[PDB]
């Protein structure tokens, strides 16, 4: 009933989403679905459209600390559905009424810490969503691609291969893929976010950065699929103006690009 | 941005005299993993490198049986390679049924090229996004054929198709002066060293990713898979 | 009027065993009262475990073995394994019945090994009814051979006899005896006896001279 | 598909439940016009002899679905000799495409042994079986009514099944009586489309259980 | 060989059929029904070549049932008879002809009772009484001798029993039992089997 | 469709055709100017017989016209095979307008750019009909086609009366062309066909010359 | 996040300048929409878990089938709605039965998957053929492109990669079938986050001894008694 | 354009169309017709010009005649409308139809189909020009269940008086068809010039009486 | 060929001999003339052995496709109607089939005589073959619906034995099956010499 209430309250009330219509969010995050808008009990889809309809709404400047304090609270939860949808919520909540956040030096830092934090979670889906929203916050320039950002991503890319445990495989020691490979996937996924944040232009930092992703093709799954989707998505959008995109690369960097096999399983 | 008026369908000539859909299908084969084919005086060996969707999946096949004397290897869309295998297997069956003899490999390759020219010229149908590498043995000795999405077919001393197969062609053109006088094991090791040079620096030829297909004079076409490539790979040298 | 058939003679024979299958046939191709050739064997290696014996109208025999060989290759392409003896049996039942209304005038006997290593003999009519037998003679002198095989391999109409399993050497002796006795009285049978033995080691193939009349 | 599914929600409410020895299937008959003859608007169509169907949605698209299912009941009965299963003709109706048609359908009836069945087709072809269901306008609230009142003791006799269907329609159909259309089966017999007098009697016994 | 008879009175149609299925010297079945209920007030009675009877008559059965389901009302016996005759004549010169001899009985609400004779060529005739089989030769004269248009249904069952007693007396084939039905304003009624 | 209105634009650019239904017959006069003196005017005909009792004329596009002349004559003779009776004019216009409608429904073709004036005589009674490129057909007392057909259709509406003879209808069909001829018609640059009880025939230019001399 | 399209995607039969058919590309990465479905091949048989997502308690759970019986030795779990899969399922059943009619033997899981993949040549269904033939127990994934591959653990559907990264870790070659069933339930409960009961998951096993077997409600709840 | 009425009574049905000529010399021998007999016991009127009118009308006649060929009975009237509306469902003819008939199951009948493939049974309706004006004038004055052909012809000329555009209602401008049952036979009688004159002058005598 | 089947209280007993001839030449003494369609239906083999084999194997294929598509086993009336509809498409062309589809569906035990001419009749007892008349004699003298199980076995064995004794084209071994509520069982394969020593001495 209160979900159908916030549904109608989203576009009608003068001060949308008061500070106690905000503790209703972390309970609504863990019950919303992830992928599809298909028929889920009329309460999941009711919570999905309510969350989509409520990020899309103006905030006050005194209110952007409070919502982001709610968001980093329920991005620290144990529900990966919740951590996915706080990261889609942040994704719509920033760009709609984006400056309000840019006129806060502590909110931009809180959002970048939140997206870098969720970029290294145990669920692959929320890691992919954090890469998508990092790449989108970096595209609109809300978030700047720092030199500490490159240092953090490249220091995550060099973690180690975990030296796969021959313990038959343990006794009961699994169900979580790793603590080591999740860091390499986080770092590669952040570099992919940075090279996908510039879809139609190669900047000066991209050619050196894109050579780093080329060293992670044969890096095992899930890092392989992230590299392949990232570089396929790269060169499907950089072909329309490639005669001046190629000039930012060196001749020893265009040769490395064409020697990439980023092609799906229904090839070869 | 630079949007092209002429790369819409295959039945459109550009004013530069080109057909861009044929050209764009020509690099559907560089979307496939590398494959080396090479022949001696007595044998023709197809060596291919194959990849897996995961560590739990089982390494997509690239060498395919066509007859007892013809075996091909594929690079590009494996859905078009299946159409081509079904066609080529049926042509081999038809002329072993009518004439009770194996196909000349060049006649089947000509017949493939006549098949694949038809979607390069007729509307609403794409060129075949696969290139084949065709080993065969017949009365004229062993044969290595390359067919491309441009419906152009090539009679080869040795050839590599697939992604970053330039380096294998740099190997093969350098070493083709001694392919004919090889025995079987040295010809397979030449094909492996050509395939091993289509690799990055951390990767190596293992029993899971290497598939070897050999036809010869007194040998029918046989695909050597996982355990069977161990005699062929445990005689090579370390990567230079 | 045009007649699409001719009886080319020929007697075939298969016998199953504990670990063997012996398929035998004469080599005379006949027509009317003439002899086309004296070296035309009626057994055909299909796989490394299976020999088919074909007798009747020889044009249908040639066509039908070529169809079976093509279907073996189509099977091995679509299924990545050679056929079993029972699968060739069931497939040939379908092939022969697809030509129900203008039949293959062919008497088929498939002899080979099953998938546990034992001998298997399948006996077909021209329209594809088959069953697995212990032994079967088909073709020109089947009504001659089949009572003696009922006597000696089947141990029928005998009292106080020991039912030993048939070994390979004694079954070879029985095959050579029955085709000498059929070459005497059947005029279409003669000139040689091609014997194909299917074992675990493979298919070995022998020939024995018969009468030339 | 989504167009065809929004064609259903505009359509009239159809309720079906399945009992022990009865399947009841009730539709909101709707005031069409004044000089309109209401005989031609059916909305409840018998399919074979033991399979009935109510739809919700476009009546021009429904009539061709009804006709194709009604032919295939006889074709199945002519090739296989037995009547269709409600599973069978439900799977056939959900398999029909035109576009998809633009109807949802509640398909009640009995199979040869004598089992009551209730099935529900979507315009995307993704049928499934029900113990009670509603399609049409106001269908989710009638279905919410039916996860409360479909019990074993509310369907145990033959009349309480009909009254469960009427109470389910009387949520969204506010005319209170004369403006609903019923049909029961009572296995091995036929359709028995309920009279306006019999519906009014059942409505009277439902109303008499509401002052108490 | 297979016997049909219909006797059509003022407000009814009495129909009977023999109850025997045969295979060349033997009877394989002695409770075999040759009456196929088209609708609630129409019976088709079908004899003829084996296989063709059940195929043609069940085709007509499912199409009359399809008519009722599509339309919400039944075919009349005239309309069902003319539909049956149209299908039997349209299949006559085709690649698949049905060699079936038909009686169509039925009570119409408006036109009263009706009995339709139809042979394998599909010439349709309406008759007060009609019969198929070789026993028709022995019993149509008894019908001609004793039928009156105002015959009661008890007197009609008596006349039927006379015809079947002639079959027991004079006819060469063992036809012991006979399925007997009346179509009324109340539908199709099973009477007792006239057995011998 | 928009191609039907654009096909009517090609009809109204065509040469004038005038057809008048008299009491004892129907005329069909048309405009036939040769673009130069090099063209043999004897060669190609615009007024055209379909049967012995039905003729027609057009405005718009001649090659489109011959396609329906050929198919009107086929529909007429396949009526005559079935019935051994000359086809009624109205039945033939239904058949031909069904053909002319077929090329508007199907894609990948255009409509005809031609509008037909079908005349006839059947059962002692004349007929005037116009088939439009849409496939629609209208029965007329008198109408114009082609270039300035509007002005012709109101010139006819002033000079039409029902107790009119065939010769007087030839006289007022020449006048309706002459209201828009642009430059002194002769027997070699118009073309008249008449139906009467004797059947359809196209008037010989020697017979057109005397009608022109009477004006 | 924003919008990143080019001139070379969503052309239905048109290669890109890198040899790619992006109309087909996006129509394969739109069949992730289905619910999750985990098959694990073990030496004791193959197991198939799929989540069911029942709408209402008025609806029969045995009426939406997400694991079907292809033959007595082959089951198949689809992701996506059943009506997209049902021509592929019917094709697989008809192919096993035609192979039986001609050959008097059971068709292999690879040949059934190949015969379906021929009919898939998109068609927008990811399938998981699990079964037992003469090559032991075998599991086959067939993505909507038509590409099929043997795989000894595979998750298809909504959280295919997050569950696949867990299947990369729990799986080993010496895994028993009960350990595989417990592991597939743990990963389904992980990618679902709901309580695990016999109304939101199906489970079926194909063992070398017995036939294709769907778990009943009593047999299913014994498995989740210790998860 | 064009318009026609259709009015159901207890002892018959009528169609009452327009005959308005667009030009002074359109002959009208051809355009005079507006009522289209379809079989022995059923007639129709179209909303459109004569060319597509005949395209519909001959298909309706052909469906009725193949029904007569199969069953040797005339086609029931809703069933011919169902057949053509199933033809017009597969084509989604921008023309509406108005059917009068009599069949043995349902008596005198009055149907109206739209281009989209739907149809409805009416007791009085109008299609074409000033349709809504005519049905709004008709819903007032049509007495349901108690009208005869005398009152139905009176309603027909009363509605056509103030919905036809012709500015003076004369017998040259209206086709009236009357479908009655006369001793076991359906009579589709196109009601002729002198009787339409007598019914217009009787109508005008009533309006000039009520003006006093 | 002699094949009989009869329904009684405990199922339907299916019985056949095993002799296939070719003219006067006896081609085989070991023919399996009771065709095991699926684990719940039997057919028999009279006429063309290839025709009975092929068309009941095609019926087996269609019954298993039915059970897969519908999650329930087919009825006996439906399977026999499928077989009759299949062989009715080839009337005149020369099929020689006559058979008895035997099962236990949820209408009880089932028995349907289906032949290539198109007779599809239910019934309590049937007997198909060349020696069908000689089996009908003994079977009709011994039949009741209330036989015991071993007595019904003896009735069907002895009826097939007498049919083999009089018919020249019947002989070999009697093959006796029992279709019970949970499928069929194969109860005996008795040689006719053994039954001759049993019934006379």
UniProtKB/Swiss-Prot annotation, chain B:
Statement: the UniProt record of this protein carries the keyword Thylakoid: no
Chain positions of cross-link Glycyl lysine isopeptide (Lys-Gly) (interchain with G-Cter in ubiquitin): 115, 208
Alphabetized InterPro entries for the sequence: Ntn_hydrolases_N, Proteasome_alpha, Proteasome_alpha-type, Proteasome_alpha1, Proteasome_asu_N, Proteasome_sua/b
Modified residues (Phosphoserine): 110, 177
Protein's recorded name: Proteasome subunit alpha type-1
Family: Belongs to the peptidase T1A family.
Expression induction or repression: Induced in breast cancer tissue (at protein level). Up-regulated in liver tumor tissues.
Glycosylation sites: 110
Function statement: Component of the 20S core proteasome complex involved in the proteolytic degradation of most intracellular proteins. This complex plays numerous essential roles within the cell by associating with different regulatory particles. Associated with two 19S regulatory particles, forms the 26S proteasome and thus participates in the ATP-dependent degradation of ubiquitinated proteins.
Modified residues (N-acetylmethionine): 1
CDD domains (alphabetical): proteasome_alpha_type_1 (cd03749)
Gene Ontology MF terms in the entry: lipopolysaccharide binding
Lineage top rank: taxon: Eukaryota
Keywords: Acetylation, Cytoplasm, Glycoprotein, Immunity, Isopeptide bond, Nucleus, Phosphoprotein, Proteasome, Ubl conjugation
Subcellular location: Cytoplasm; Nucleus
Gene Ontology terms describing biological process: immune system process; negative regulation of inflammatory response to antigenic stimulus; proteasome-mediated ubiquitin-dependent protein catabolic process
Annotated transmembrane regions: none
From Swiss-Prot, chain C:
Main location: cytoplasm
In-chain residues carrying the UniProt-annotated modification N6-acetyllysine: 176
A GO cellular component annotation in the UniProt record: proteasome complex
Localization in the cell: Cytoplasm; Nucleus
Protein origin, superkingdom: Eukaryota
PROSITE patterns found in the cross-reference section: PROTEASOME_BETA_1 (PS00854), PROTEASOME_BETA_2 (PS51476)
Phosphotyrosine modified-residue sites: 122
Record keywords, A-Z: Acetylation, Cytoplasm, Deafness, Glycoprotein, Host-virus interaction, Intellectual disability, Nucleus, Phosphoprotein, Proteasome
Phosphoserine modified-residue sites: 34, 40, 134
Pathological condition linked to this protein in its record: Neurodevelopmental disorder with microcephaly, hypotonia, and absent language: An autosomal recessive disorder characterized by microcephaly, intellectual disability with absent speech, severe developmental delay, short stature, and hypotonia. Affected individuals also manifest aggressive behavior and have hearing loss.
Biological role stated in the UniProt entry: Non-catalytic component of the 20S core proteasome complex involved in the proteolytic degradation of most intracellular proteins. This complex plays numerous essential roles within the cell by associating with different regulatory particles. Associated with two 19S regulatory particles, forms the 26S proteasome and thus participates in the ATP-dependent degradation of ubiquitinated proteins.
Family: Belongs to the peptidase T1B family.
Protein's name in the database: Proteasome subunit beta type-1
Species this chain originates from: Homo sapiens (Human)
Gene behind this protein: PSMB1
UniProtKB/Swiss-Prot annotation, chain E:
Top-level lineage group: Eukaryota
UniProt-listed SUPFAM superfamilies: N-terminal nucleophile aminohydrolases (Ntn hydrolases)
CDD domains recorded: proteasome_beta_type_2 (cd03758)
Gene Ontology terms: cellular component: cytoplasm; cytosol; extracellular exosome; membrane; nucleoplasm; nucleus; proteasome complex; proteasome core complex
Induction / repression: Up-regulated in ovarian cancer cell lines.
Chief location: cytoplasm
Keywords: Acetylation, Cytoplasm, Host-virus interaction, Nucleus, Proteasome
Stated family: Belongs to the peptidase T1B family.
Function: Non-catalytic component of the 20S core proteasome complex involved in the proteolytic degradation of most intracellular proteins. This complex plays numerous essential roles within the cell by associating with different regulatory particles. Associated with two 19S regulatory particles, forms the 26S proteasome and thus participates in the ATP-dependent degradation of ubiquitinated proteins.
Protein's UniProt name: Proteasome subunit beta type-2
Encoding gene per record: PSMB2
Curated annotation (Swiss-Prot), chain G:
N-acetylmethionine modifications at: 1
Pfam families: Proteasome, Proteasome_A_N
Phosphoserine, modified sites: 16, 56, 63
Source organism superkingdom: Eukaryota
Compartments, record wording: Cytoplasm; Nucleus
Keyword Transcription regulation: no
Modified residues (Phosphothreonine): 55
Xref: InterPro entries: Ntn_hydrolases_N, Proteasome_alpha, Proteasome_alpha-type, Proteasome_alpha_type_5, Proteasome_asu_N, Proteasome_sua/b
Keywords: Acetylation, Cytoplasm, Glycoprotein, Nucleus, Phosphoprotein, Proteasome
Induction trigger: Up-regulated in colon cancer cell lines. Up-regulated in fetal Down syndrome (DS) brain (at protein level). May be the target of the transcriptional activator NFE2L2.
PANTHER family: PROTEASOME SUBUNIT ALPHA/BETA
Protein role: Component of the 20S core proteasome complex involved in the proteolytic degradation of most intracellular proteins. This complex plays numerous essential roles within the cell by associating with different regulatory particles. Associated with two 19S regulatory particles, forms the 26S proteasome and thus participates in the ATP-dependent degradation of ubiquitinated proteins.
Name of the molecule in the record: Proteasome subunit alpha type-5
Organism the protein comes from: Homo sapiens (Human)
């Amino acid at each position: 009933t209160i979900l159908k209430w916030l549904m109608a309250s989203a576009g009608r009330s003068f001060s949308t989403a008061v500070t106690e219509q905000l503790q209703l969010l972390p309970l609504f995050f863990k019950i919303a679905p992830v992928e599809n808008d298909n028929s889920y009990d009329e309460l999941k889809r009711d919570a999905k459209l309510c969350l989509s309809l409520m990020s899309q709404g103006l905030l006050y400047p005194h209110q952007v600390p409070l919502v982001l304090q709610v968001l980093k609270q329920t991005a620290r939860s144990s529900s990966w559905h919740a951590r996915y949808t706080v990261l889609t919520y942040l994704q719509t909540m920033v760009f709609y009424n984006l400056f309000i956040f840019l006129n806060n030096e502590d909110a931009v830092k809180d959002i970048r810490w939140l997206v870098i934090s969720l970029l290294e979670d145990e669920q692959l889906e929320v890691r992919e969503m954090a890469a998508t929203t990092l790449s989108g916050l970096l595209q609109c320039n809300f978030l700047t691609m720092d030199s500490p950002m490159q240092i953090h991503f490249e220091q995550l890319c060099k973690t180690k291969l975990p030296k796969k445990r021959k313990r038959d495989p343990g006794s009961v020691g699994d169900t979580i893929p790793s603590a080591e490979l999740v860091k390499r996937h986080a770092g590669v996924l952040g570099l992919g976010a940075c090279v996908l944040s510039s879809p139609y232009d190669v900047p000066t930092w991209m050619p050196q950065l894109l050579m780093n992703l080329s060293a992670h093709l044969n890096d095992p799954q899930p890092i392989e699929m992230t590299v392949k989707k990232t570089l396929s998505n790269f060169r499907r959008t950089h072909h329309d103006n490639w005669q001046e995109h190629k000039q930012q690369f060196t001749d020893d960097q265009l040769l490395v690009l064409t020697d990439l096999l980023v092609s799906p399983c229904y090839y070869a | 941005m630079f949007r092209n008026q002429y790369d819409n369908d295959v039945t459109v000539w550009s004013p530069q005299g080109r057909i861009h859909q044929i050209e764009y299908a020509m690099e559907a084969v560089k979307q496939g993993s590398a494959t080396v084919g090479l022949k001696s005086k007595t044998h023709a060996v197809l060596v291919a490198l194959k990849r897996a969707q995961s560590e739990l999946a089982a390494h997509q096949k690239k060498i395919l049986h066509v007859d007892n004397h013809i075996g091909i290897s594929i690079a590009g869309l494996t859905a078009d390679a299946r159409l081509l295998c079904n066609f080529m297997r049926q042509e081999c069956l038809d002329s072993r049924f009518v004439f009770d003899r194996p196909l000349p490999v060049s006649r089947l390759v000509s017949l493939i090229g006549s098949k694949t020219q038809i979607p390069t010229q007729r509307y609403g149908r794409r060129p075949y996004g696969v290139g084949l590498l065709i080993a065969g043995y017949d009365d004229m000795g062993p044969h290595i054929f390359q067919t491309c999405p441009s419906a152009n077919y090539f009679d080869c001393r040795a050839m590599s198709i697939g992604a970053r197969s330039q380096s294998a062609r740099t190997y093969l053109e350098r070493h083709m002066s001694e392919f004919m006088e090889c025995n079987l094991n040295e010809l397979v090791k030449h094909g492996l060293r050509a395939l091993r040079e289509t690799l990055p620096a951390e990767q190596d030829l293992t029993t899971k990713n290497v598939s070897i297909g050999i036809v010869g004079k007194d040998l029918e076409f046989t695909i050597y898979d996982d355990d069977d490539v161990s005699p062929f790979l445990e005689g090579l040298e370390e990567r230079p | 009027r045009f007649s699409p058939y001719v009886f080319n003679g020929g007697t075939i024979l298969a016998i199953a065993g504990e670990d063997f299958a012996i398929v035998a046939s004469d080599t005379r191709l006949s027509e009317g009262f003439s002899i086309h050739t004296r070296d035309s064997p009626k057994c055909y290696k299909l796989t490394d475990k299976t020999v088919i014996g074909c007798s009747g109208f020889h044009g249908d025999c040639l066509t039908l073995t070529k169809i079976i060989e093509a279907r073996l290759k189509m099977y091995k392409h679509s299924n990545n394994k050679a056929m079993t003896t029972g699968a060739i049996a069931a497939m040939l039942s379908t092939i022969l019945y697809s030509r129900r209304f203008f039949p293959y005038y062919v008497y088929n006997i498939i002899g080979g090994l099953d998938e546990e290593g034992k001998g298997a003999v399948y006996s077909f009519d021209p329209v594809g009814s088959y069953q697995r037998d212990s032994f079967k003679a088909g073709g020109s002198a089947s009504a001659m051979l089949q009572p003696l095989l009922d006597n000696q391999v089947g141990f029928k109409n005998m009292q106080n006899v020991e039912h030993v399993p048939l070994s390979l050497d004694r079954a070879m002796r029985l095959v050579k005896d029955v085709f000498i006795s059929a070459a005497e009285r059947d005029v279409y049978t003669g000139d040689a006896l091609r014997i194909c033995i299917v074992t675990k080691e493979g298919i070995r193939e022998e020939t024995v001279s018969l009468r030339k009349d | 598909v989504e167009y065809a599914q929004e064609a259903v929600k505009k359509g009239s409410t159809a309720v079906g439940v399945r009992g022990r020895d009865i399947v009841v299937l009730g539709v909101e008959k709707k005031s069409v016009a004044k000089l309109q003859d209401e005989r031609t608007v059916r909305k409840i169509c018998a399919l074979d002899d033991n399979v009935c169907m109510a739809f919700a949605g476009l009546t021009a698209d429904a009539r061709i679905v009804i006709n194709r299912a009604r032919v295939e009941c006889q074709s199945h009965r002519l090739t296989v000799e037995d009547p269709v299963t409600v599973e069978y003709i439900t799977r056939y109706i959900a398999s029909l495409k035109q576009r998809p048609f633009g109807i949802s359908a509640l398909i009640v009836g009995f199979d040869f042994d004598g089992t009551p069945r209730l099935y529900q087709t979507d315009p995307s072809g993704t049928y499934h079986a029900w113990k009670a269901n509603a399609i049409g306008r106001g269908a989710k609230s009638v279905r919410e009514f039916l996860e409360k009142n479909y019990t074993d003791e509310a369907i145990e006799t033959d009349d309480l099944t009909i009254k469960l269907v009427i109470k389910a329609l009387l949520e969204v159909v506010q005319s209170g009586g004369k403006n609903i259309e019923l049909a029961v089966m009572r296995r091995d017999q036929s359709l028995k489309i309920l009279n306006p007098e019999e519906i009014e009697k059942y409505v009277a016994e439902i109303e008499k259980e509401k002052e108490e | 060989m297979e016997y049909l008879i219909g006797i059509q009175g003022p407000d009814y149609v009495l129909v009977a059929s023999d109850r025997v299925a045969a295979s060349n010297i033997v009877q394989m079945k002695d409770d075999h029904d040759k009456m196929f209920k088209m609708s609630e007030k129409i019976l088709l009675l079908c004899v003829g070549e084996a296989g063709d009877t059940v195929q043609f008559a069940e085709y007509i059965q499912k199409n009359v049932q399809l008519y009722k389901m599509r339309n919400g009302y039944e075919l009349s016996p005239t309309a069902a008879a003319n539909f049956t005759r149209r299908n039997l004549a349209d299949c006559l010169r085709s690649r698949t002809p049905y060699h079936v001899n038909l009686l169509l009985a039925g009570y119409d609400e408006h036109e009263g009772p009706a009995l339709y004779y139809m042979d394998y060529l599909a010439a349709l005739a309406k008759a007060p009484f009609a019969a198929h089989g070789y026993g028709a030769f022995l019993t149509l004269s008894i019908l001609d001798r004793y039928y009156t248009p105002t015959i009661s249904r008890e007197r009609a069952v008596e006349l039927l029993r006379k015809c079947l007693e002639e079959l027991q007396k004079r006819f060469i084939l063992n036809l012991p039992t006979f399925s007997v039905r009346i179509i009324d304003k109340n539908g199709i009624h099973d009477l007792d089997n006239i057995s011998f | 469709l928009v191609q039907i209105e654009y096909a009517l634009a090609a009809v109204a650019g065509g040469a004038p055709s005038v057809g008048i239904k008299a009491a004892n017959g129907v005329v069909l006069a048309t405009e036939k100017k040769q673009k130069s003196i090099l063209y043999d005017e004897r060669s190609v005909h615009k007024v055209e017989p379909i049967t012995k009792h039905i003729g027609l004329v057009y405005s718009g596009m001649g090659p489109d016209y011959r396609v329906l002349v050929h198919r009107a004559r086929k529909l007429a003779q396949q009526y005559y095979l079935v019935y051994q009776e000359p086809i009624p004019t109205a039945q033939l216009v239904q058949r031909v307008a069904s053909v002319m409608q077929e090329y508007t429904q199907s894609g990948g073709v255009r409509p005809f750019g031609v509008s037909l004036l079908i005349c006839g005589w059947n059962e002692g009674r004349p007929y005037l009909f116009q088939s439009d490129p849409s496939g629609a057909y209208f029965a007329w007392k008198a109408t114009a086609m082609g270039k300035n057909y509007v002005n012709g259709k109101t010139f006819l509406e002033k000079r039409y009366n029902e107790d009119l003879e065939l010769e007087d209808a030839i006289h007022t069909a020449i006048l309706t062309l002459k209201e828009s001829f642009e430059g002194q018609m002769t027997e070699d640059n118009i073309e008249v066909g008449i139906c009467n009880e004797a059947g359809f025939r196209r008037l010989t230019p020697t017979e057109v010359k005397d009608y022109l001399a009477a004006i | 996040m924003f919008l990143t399209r080019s001139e070379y995607d969503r052309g239905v039969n048109t290669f890109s300048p890198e040899g790619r058919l992006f109309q087909v590309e996006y129509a394969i990465e739109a069949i992730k929409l289905g619910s999750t479905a985990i098959g694990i091949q073990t030496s004791e048989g193959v197991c198939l878990a799929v989540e069911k997502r029942i709408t209402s308690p008025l609806m029969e759970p045995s009426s939406i089938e997400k694991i079907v019986e292809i033959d007595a030795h082959i089951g198949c779990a689809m992701s996506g709605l059943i009506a997209d899969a049902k021509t592929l399922i019917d094709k697989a059943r008809v192919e096993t039965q035609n192979h039986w009619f001609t050959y008097n033997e059971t068709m292999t899981v690879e040949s059934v998957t190949q015969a379906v993949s021929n009919l898939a040549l998109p068609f927008g269904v990811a399938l998981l053929f699990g079964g037992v033939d003469e090559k032991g127990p075998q599991l086959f994934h067939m993505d909507p492109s038509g590409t099929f591959v043997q795989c000894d653990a595979r998750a298809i559907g909504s959280a295919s990669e997050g569950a696949q990264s867990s299947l990369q870790e729990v799986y080993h070659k010496s895994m028993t079938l009960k350990e595989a069933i417990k592991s597939s339930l743990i990963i389904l409960k992980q990618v679902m986050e709901e309580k695990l009961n016999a109304t939101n998951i199906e489970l079926a096993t194909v063992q070398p001894g017995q036939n294709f077997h769907m778990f009943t409600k009593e047999e299913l709840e014994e498995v989740i008694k210790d998860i | 354009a064009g318009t026609c009425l259709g009015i159901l009574a207890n002892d018959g049905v009528l169609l009452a169309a327009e005959r308005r000529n667009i030009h002074k010399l359109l002959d009208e021998v051809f355009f005079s017709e507006k009522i289209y007999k379809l079989n022995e016991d059923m007639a129709c009127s179209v909303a459109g010009i004569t060319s597509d009118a005949n395209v519909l009308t001959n298909e309706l006649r052909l469906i009725a005649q193949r029904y007569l060929l199969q069953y040797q009975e005339p086609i029931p009237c809703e069933q011919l409308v169902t057949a053509l509306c199933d033809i017009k469902q597969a084509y989604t003819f921008g023309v509406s139809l108005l059917y009068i008939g009599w069949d043995k199951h349902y008596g005198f009948q009055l149907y109206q189909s739209d281009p989209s493939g739907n149809y409805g049974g009416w007791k009085a309706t109008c299609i074409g020009n000033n349709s809504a004006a005519a049905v709004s004038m008709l819903k007032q004055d049509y007495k349901e269940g108690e009208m005869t052909l005398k009152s139905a012809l009176a309603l027909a000329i009363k509605v056509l008086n103030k919905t036809m555009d012709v500015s003076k209602l004369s017998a040259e401008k209206v086709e009236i068809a009357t479908l009655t049952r006369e001793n076991g036979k359906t009579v589709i009688r196109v009601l002729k010039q002198k009787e339409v004159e007598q019914l217009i002058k009787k109508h005008e005598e009533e309006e000039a009486k009520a003006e006093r | 060929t002699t094949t009989l089947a009869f329904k009684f209280r405990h199922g339907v007993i299916v019985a056949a001999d095993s002799r296939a001839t070719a003219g006067a030449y006896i081609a085989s003494q070991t023919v399996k003339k009771v065709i095991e369609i699926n684990p719940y239906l039997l057919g028999t083999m009279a006429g063309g052995a290839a025709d009975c084999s092929f068309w009941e194997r095609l019926l087996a294929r269609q019954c298993r496709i039915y059970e897969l598509r519908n999650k329930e086993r087919i009825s006996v009336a439906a399977a026999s109607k499928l077989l009759a509809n299949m062989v009715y498409q080839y009337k005149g062309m020369g099929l020689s089939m006559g058979t008895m589809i035997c099962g236990w569906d949820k209408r009880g035990p089932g028995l349907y005589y289906v032949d290539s001419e198109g007779n599809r009749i239910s019934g309590a007892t049937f007997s198909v073959g060349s020696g069908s008349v000689y089996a009908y004699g003994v079977m009709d003298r011994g039949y009741s619906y209330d036989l015991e199980v071993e007595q019904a076995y003896d009735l069907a064995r002895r009826a097939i034995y007498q049919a083999t004794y009089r018919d020249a084209y019947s002989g070999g071994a009697v093959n006796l099956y029992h279709v019970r509520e949970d499928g069929w069982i194969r109860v005996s394969s008795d040689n006719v010499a053994d039954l001759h020593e049993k019934y006379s001495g």
